[PDB]
Design a protein around this ligand. Structure first.
Ligand code: HEM
Ligand code: HEM
Ligand SMILES: COc1cc(N)nc(CCc2cc(CCN(C)C)cc(F)c2F)c1
Ligand SMILES: COc1cc(N)nc(CCc2cc(CCN(C)C)cc(F)c2F)c1
Ligand SMILES: C[C@H](O)[C@H](O)[C@H]1CNc2nc(N)[nH]c(=O)c2N1
Ligand SMILES: C[C@H](O)[C@H](O)[C@H]1CNc2nc(N)[nH]c(=O)c2N1
Ligand SMILES: [Zn+2]
Lengths: 414, 413
């Protein structure tokens, strides 16, 4: 009813009433908490009986947000939706409703630390698309608009909603821009180990790999349930940063670069019981996503030993903390490099500070802010960011972004 | 569903949990809201509430010694059943006290160091009756546990709660802490987290040396009477000066810390009995000192001072000057303890050990409850193996619980 959270660093207490509007399973029970489990646990289509309540609840909340609850427009819209569901088994969102739904799914993303920007989101309605070529064109316009010569802008492109489950639109790429990974016969991995499987799918589909360390993968686009199709993103639209270090002249000899635009394309946008299986959305990077996870995860580029080596660090025992020392210098390089090239990025201190400020405002104006602590806290120097000491309540608000099966596991080929 | 799986996203190892079917008290979560990051979710049990609690634990004990449904098991069930009728409560056999203590540590979802759980030295202090007696026990605990720097894990168990008005309580949160003194100009000398406890000790008669690292006196409460002050003999209190293996100016910071981390404010539940005074100790993980004690803004807060001596650009947060000074502080804490042959473990070794332990626990027990929010070190998170480890969290008994501060709940004499 009235739930409390405390910041153990500042002793500030906040009061959550928004949790009364939560919905689909945390996955937790009174006996087992699953707050550190990554995912939960085809035919999947909603019926008329399932869709009426979900649509109504979304429409109700839309009109309340525009200060028109109970208005004639509100009542007529419900009637229009209710009739459309009854005669067609689904309904279409108005443009205003789609923009509202997209922004609130981001606002509701428990795991996103960037949510302070949630209302400044550019929504591209691609519901008139019918083909993978159509999708490719939409996506290139997304990438170019968002990139903006390095002054990045948040954006989402929404492809037609799922109908009977058999004509989905999907982006098979997990992110719009990622580098290929080639597993070698000798066991090693050239490129990005995380993408070996998807790279092989692309090669099989006919992609000709240049077999390099930083090869931008082609897009694999699926329209209306058909076989997916390959397209090369135009290289001039793919902004990259060469990674160097302000103090270590040799850091650039590491030959490192990253792409400037993070763009999640494998998730599902649920608005009023409708499912948008293809909705690629993009923002800008927090430094540690590249500097900690992309470069230093043992199952990724894995450069700590090579960086430490160059730093002449004693790597005999772990208690020398040579990993900790090198990780910091890498993340200094990555911020310095993006900043030097006027490409938008945010370090993990600034980003966590703004999220606390965002969180407190949400409690004030909105009565709560779901947050997944496991994901909000950065993967280095955790306890010296303000969110480490912040208690957080986690629950699912709709509209929301959701995970969905990898399309290669589900598709029925022809 | 009678099985739950967990996956490690770095090594792709999957483990199957079945031990969760024996979970008990609340987690605080529901199917609608998860509290995995909330720190805390006469009044004692009636007669109906105690018998089954004691019942499960005895079964658990005898099932653990290959003797379930066997010889002594039967009439011990009857004997415990007998005693609760007369005494309202009951008493554990020595073997049972040892068993539940090691199992509360084993069951401690938030403890990364549980690979050692069966190597606990248990001090039965249930003949104690006075704070003087408590102090004697605690001194012997401290001296045993310190062991000239080769630290050994130990617990001292004092008399169990009976009615609630006669609790035994160690009022200090840990057995060894430094004091905290408010200053006329709003600032704070020493450890800020201890200002309130320090002021109680002064109000109780403690003469404060009013420096930073003044060890606090023990404030011991026996049988529910007023607590009393005792000064731990300093030759029992092992302290380590902090120097840097590179930076000569580090020792000029005047930094030191104690060797023995001993939690003294928790409650031990065994068979529905409530051991309100049960100080237990292990040995330090280095990040506890270098990251939390030294660099929390609400604690010793030395980041700004260390970065100055390292001459780091302190204007913008994107230089990561904080992250840099933090690494250095933690190199020195470990290096200092190691040089003084005082036991300490860095966050890399500790978390690798806990992954071994988790592997063992699923292998031999079918589950190892774990709190990701607490297991993950407070620095260099993702480069340790437990970042990428899915963990299920659930409450197994015997267990250590929190309890309120006694100065909020004590009707004085
Ligand atoms: C604009 C600046 C943004 C920042 C700084 C930001 C930051 C982050 C970070 C650091 C994560 C965790 C990343 C990871 O470990 O994979 C994350 C996750 C997420 N973000 Fe944001 N993000 C931004 C934009 C967006 C936008 C525009 C959307 C949606 C419209 C969004 C929705 C999400 C979602 C759903 C997740 C969870 C993904 C998952 O569970 O895999 N974010 N964000
Ligand atoms: C032997 C070496 C040990 C190591 C390296 C170790 C390590 C740790 C660490 C780092 C924490 C996190 C505490 C914090 O950050 O505030 C913790 C928590 C805890 N440990 Fe251990 N520990 C050890 C021994 C023990 C022993 C002997 C016991 C009990 C018999 C124990 C029971 C607990 C409990 C109950 C917690 C949770 C405390 C709370 O919830 O506030 N540990 N341990
Ligand atoms: C949409 O806005 C965003 C802003 C920022 N900063 N980060 C993201 C995550 C984007 C992202 C995440 C991941 C990791 C996926 N795991 C499941 C392994 C890899 C990427 F290559 C990528 F790009 C999104
Ligand atoms: C029993 O064995 C152990 C081994 C290790 N390494 N750590 C502990 C907890 C050590 C410990 C924890 C805290 C808690 C501080 N915040 C909650 C405010 C304060 C201490 F003064 C202290 F010492 C116990
Ligand atoms: C908000 C959060 O619950 C709280 O800050 C926790 C996070 N994880 C922790 N982990 C450890 N080991 N010790 C702590 O005090 C905390 N604090
Ligand atoms: C097991 C655990 O859930 C997993 O390693 C999580 C931990 N926290 C994370 N936090 C973020 N931001 N991103 C991640 O990929 C993960 N991985
Ligand atoms: Zn939970």
């Amino acid at each position: 009813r009235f739930l409390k959270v405390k910041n153990w660093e500042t002793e500030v207490v906040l009061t959550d009433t928004l949790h009364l509007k939560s919905t689909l399973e945390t996955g937790c029970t009174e006996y087992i908490c699953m707050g550190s489990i990554m995912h939960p646990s085809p035919e999947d289509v909603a019926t008329k009986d399932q869709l009426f309540p979900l649509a109504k609840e979304f429409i109700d909340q839309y009109y309340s947000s525009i200060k028109r609850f109970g208005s004639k427009a509100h009542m007529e819209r419900l009637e229009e939706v209710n009739k459309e569901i009854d005669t067609t088994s689904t309904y279409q969102l108005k443009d205003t409703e789609l923009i509202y739904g997209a922004k609130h799914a981001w606002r509701n993303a428990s795991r996103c630390v960037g949510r302070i920007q949630w209302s400044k989101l550019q929504v591209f309605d691609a519901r008139d698309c019918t083909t993978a070529h159509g999708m490719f064109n939409y996506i290139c316009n997304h990438v170019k608009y968002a990139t903006n010569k390095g002054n990045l802008r948040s954006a989402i492109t929404i492809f037609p909603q799922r109908t009977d489950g058999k004509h989905d639109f999907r982006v098979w790429n997990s992110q719009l821009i990622r580098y290929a990974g080639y597993k070698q016969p000798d066991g090693s991995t050239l490129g990005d180990p995380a993408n070996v499987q998807f790279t092989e799918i692309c090669i099989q589909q006919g992609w000709k790999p240049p077999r390099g360390r930083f090869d931008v993968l082609p897009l694999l686009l699926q329209a209306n349930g058909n076989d997916p199709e390959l397209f090369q993103i135009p290289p001039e639209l793919v902004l990259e940063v060469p990674i160097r270090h302000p103090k270590f002249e040799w850091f650039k000899d590491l030959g490192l670069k990253w792409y400037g635009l993070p763009a999640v394309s494998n998730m599902l946008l649920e608005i009023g019981g409708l499912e948008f299986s293809a909705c690629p959305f993009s923002g800008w990077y927090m430094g540690t996503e590249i500097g900690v996870r992309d470069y230093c995860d043992n199952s990724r580029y894995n450069i700590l030993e090579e960086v430490a080596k160059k730093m002449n660090l004693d790597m005999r025992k772990t208690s020398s903390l040579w990993k900790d020392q090198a990780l910091v210098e890498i993340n200094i390089a990555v911020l310095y490099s993006f900043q030097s090239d006027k490409v938008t990025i945010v370090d993990h201190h600034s980003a966590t500070e703004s999220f606390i400020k965002h969180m407190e405002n949400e409690y004030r104006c909105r009565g709560g802010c779901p947050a997944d602590w496991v994901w909000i806290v950065p993967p280095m120097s955790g306890s010296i960011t303000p969110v480490f000491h912040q208690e957080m309540l986690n629950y699912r608000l709709t509209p929301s972004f959701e995970y969905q099966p990898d399309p290669w596991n589900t598709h029925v080929w022809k």
